[PDB]
Amino acid sequence: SAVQQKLAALEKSSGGRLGVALIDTADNTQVLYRGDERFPMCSTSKVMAAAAVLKQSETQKQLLNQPVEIKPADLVNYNPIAEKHVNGTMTLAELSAAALQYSDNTAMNKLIAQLGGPGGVTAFARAIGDETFRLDRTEPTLNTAIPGDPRDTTTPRAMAQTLRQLTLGHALGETQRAQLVTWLKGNTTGAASIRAGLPTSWTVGDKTGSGDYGTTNDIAVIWPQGRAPLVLVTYFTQPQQNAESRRDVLASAARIIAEGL
Numbered sequence: 192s193a194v195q196q197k198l199a200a201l202e203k204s205s206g207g208r209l210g211v212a213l214i215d216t217a218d219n220t221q222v223l224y225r226g227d228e229r230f231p232m233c234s235t236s237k238v239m240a241a242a243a244v245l246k247q248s249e250t251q252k253q254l255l256n257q258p259v260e261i262k263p264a265d266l267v268n269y270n271p272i273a274e275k276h277v278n279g280t281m282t283l284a285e286l287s288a289a290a291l292q293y294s295d296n297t298a299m300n301k302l303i304a305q306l307g308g309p310g311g312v313t314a315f316a317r318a319i320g321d322e323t324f325r326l327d328r329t330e331p332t333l334n335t336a337i338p339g340d341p342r343d344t345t346t347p348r349a350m351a352q353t354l355r356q357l358t359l360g361h362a363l364g365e366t367q368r369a370q371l372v373t374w375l376k377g378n379t380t381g382a383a384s385i386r387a388g389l390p391t392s393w394t395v396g397d398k399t400g401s402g403d404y405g406t407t408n409d410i411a412v413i414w415p416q417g418r419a420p421l422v423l424v425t426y427f428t429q430p431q432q433n434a435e436s437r438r439d440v441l442a443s444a445a446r447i448i449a450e451g452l
Contacts, residue, residue: 197447198224205440207405207429212347213448214355217419222448226348230426231336233400234294235350235410236312236326236343240302241287241374242357243315245367247305248283255284259305265297268331273297284370291374291398296330303329316353319362323349334402336428347424350410355422358396358412372396375412383438384409385423388445392416405434409441415452423448 202209202224211224248254258280261273272289273281274297281289281298283305290298306312309326316324326333327342334343356362358372375396384407386395397411406428413421425441 192222194222194447194451195224197450198444201440201443201447205427205437207427207434207437207440209440209444210347210424210426211444211448212351212422212424214351214422215419215452216355216359216421221348221351223348227346229341229344229346230408230428231334231340231402231404231406232324232326232343232345232350233334233336233402233406233408234296234299235398235400235408235424235426236324236333237290237294237299237302237400238354238357238371238375238398238410239316239324239326240299240306240312241291242363242367242371243306243312244283244287244302245363245371246315246318249364249367255282255287257283259283259286259301261297261301265300267296267300270295270297273301288374288377292377292379294380294399299330319353319356321345321349321353324353334400334406336402336404336406338404338428338430347426351422351424354410354412354424359420359422372412381409381411384441385411385413385425385445387438387442388447389413389449390415399438401436402428404432405429405436407436407438407441409438411445418452421452 213222286298289295381397394414400408
């Protein structure tokens, strides 16, 4: 299609490897570009950790209000919110919000711990029917994004389907789903990524990710004004370990997708 030729050209112009999956929930049509290739998730994996905690809260009704101590030893490389609460506590809700809306890496590690390790995050993916997602490491080493390394990867197609289920479907309870949507809509890190390729009137909830090898990712649910929502996953990684982030590629891919709907 026109759209796949334009995405291939964008990819060729960028020097990297681009993976895209769009689900249009109006007709359940899908547009895929390298849709079954593995990409390093980097911080887009935080969505799965937060959703797993939300799932636990369907039975432990008070779980999100549970205080969790933030100690200096807990701090890793990027902790914009947890830093503000060292030697104090954050609730699991506050950690989930921090992980999602600020990409706080300490918060992500506390969510992983709450789930019993990376295996507990992966287990949740399996439980909701995602056989592709794998979380193997904690922060910050899950962002190494080494070419060919299957650790901490998923595919665009798999992540789109899973994001759809978590936000628009019923993999979570009604209150939990609404909370996740509210968290994603409040993301602060996304302005230059998918959002930048889309009409300003559209409502977007997204989670970015960044890592080594210039890895630059964004996964989004999109609510156009007067139109069924869309799920869009854009993954991008590059051949040089020290390559710079290319959020403009994600904006451009979103724009190409938006041209056609």
